[PDB]
């Protein structure tokens, strides 16, 4: 859950690969797309509640 620790976006999973004197991580993340506009409210009022 650490932001940016395992790639950009919401981390899903990672896979390691070996390199000559190092390691390559393949990070799979979720990136939200195609946002729409809406009107919001904090609470609803119904029956005086």
């Amino acid at each position: 859950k650490r932001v940016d620790f395992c790639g950009k976006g919401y981390h899903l999973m990672s896979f390691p690969q070996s390199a000559p004197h190092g390691v390559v991580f393949l990070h799979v993340t979720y990136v939200p797309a195609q946002e729409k506009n809406f009107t919001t409210a904090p609470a609803i009022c119904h029956d005086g509640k």
Partner: protein, 50 residues
């Protein structure tokens, strides 16, 4: 004769310059870790909730 006296200065000044350059490497390795912590705090406290 001035060769023998110039070499005594050259040796000293080289020693002093190289001491300066070692202590800067050791001080930069410490500034680097602080900046690496600042970069993690910017990710985890400013662009998220930790």
């Amino acid at each position: 004769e001035a060769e023998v006296q110039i070499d005594r200065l050259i040796t000293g000044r080289l020693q002093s310059l190289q001491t300066y350059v070692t202590q800067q490497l050791i001080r930069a390795a410490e500034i680097r870790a602080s900046a690496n912590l600042a970069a993690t705090k910017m990710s985890e406290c400013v662009l998220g909730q930790s």
